């Protein structure tokens, strides 16, 4: 679909406030994202999977590291993604750290 | 004067003083040889006269 | 059809994988706003950008809460 | 300097280095702090990667 309305969808999702009921918030987002819209990484997957690795260490999820290394040939595997880097850049960066937590839930 | 004087000493402060941060900091990130912005600063003045601003994107 | 469910199944594959890895690392993102995310990534989008888009709609549920 | 250390051989007063462990939000500086007793020399083969990367576990602990 447009980008535009996907702007949109993206500042519905986090907050409960329309394009109308806001419209600072949904105007910045168009500020920030359309000056430098497309990428400025390229493929560099390998170096920030060995950064979630190195990430679930930390944590004593040293299971889920394990787990990440089936989950990356399978992200790679459907293909359906036209940047397998970005979306991995962007949950990394959105990390948090328990203490040395261990919590587990599915598959 | 105040205009073949001062303005002039102000002009050579100015840049002086933004070339030496430069400096400092494109020395810094070579790697000893940093003893030399230890050295020059013993009493703690001017270590914090330029940090380089941050944005993203 | 068949081959146009397959691709259905294809997508619910890697939609389950990011939601995985965005449980595991405890990230505030759900499964929804996933798929905007990943829609945008189809777009080609930096995320340099996206996350201080990111980081700045919710800075404004946690001061209209 | 400041402890009664100075007097250790000046091999493994080399072989330590800190190492930084990579930051993440809500990450406090106690977490990402361990030293890495880094050794290279035909002494490496006793004291190898894998056991260092045990030792860290038992220094963080």
Redesign the interface.
């Known amino acids: 679909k447009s980008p535009n309305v996907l702007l949109q969808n993206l500042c519905c999702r986090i907050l409960g406030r329309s394009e109308a009921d806001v419209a600072q918030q949904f105007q910045y987002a168009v500020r920030v994202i359309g000056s430098n819209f497309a990428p400025t990484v390229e493929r560099d997957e390998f170096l920030v999977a060995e950064?979630i690795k190195?990430?679930l260490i930390?944590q004593r999820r040293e299971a889920d590291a394990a787990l990440f290394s089936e989950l990356h040939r399978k992200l790679h595997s459907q293909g359906v993604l036209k940047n397998k880097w970005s979306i991995l850049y962007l949950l990394l960066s959105?990390?948090?750290?328990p203490?040395?937590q261990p919590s587990k839930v599915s598959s | 004067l105040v205009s073949g004087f001062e303005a002039t000493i102000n002009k050579f402060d100015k840049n002086f003083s933004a070339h030496l941060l430069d400096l400092l900091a494109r020395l810094s990130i070579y790697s000893g040889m940093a003893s030399v912005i230890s050295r020059l600063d013993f009493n703690g003045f001017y270590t914090e006269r330029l940090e380089r601003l941050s944005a993203e994107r | 059809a068949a081959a146009a469910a397959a691709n259905l199944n294809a997508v619910r594959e890697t939609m389950d994988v990011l939601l995985e890895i965005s449980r595991i690392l405890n990230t505030g993102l759900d499964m929804e706003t996933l798929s905007i995310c990943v829609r945008l990534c189809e777009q080609g989008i930096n995320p340099e950008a996206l996350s201080s888009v990111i980081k700045e709609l919710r800075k404004a549920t946690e001061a209209l809460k | 300097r400041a402890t009664n250390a100075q007097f250790d051989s000046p091999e493994i007063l080399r072989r330590l280095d800190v190492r930084l462990?990579?930051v993440?939000?809500?990450?406090?500086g106690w977490?990402?702090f361990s030293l890495d007793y880094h050794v290279d020399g035909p002494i490496a083969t006793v004291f190898t990667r894998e056991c260092m990367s045990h030792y860290l576990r038992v220094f963080n602990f």
Not at chain 1, 94 to 97: H, P, W
Request: glycine residues 6%; charged residues 60%; aromatic residues 0%.
């Open positions: 950064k190195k990430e930390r959105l990390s948090e750290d203490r040395r | 462990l990579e993440s939000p809500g990450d406090t977490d990402v």
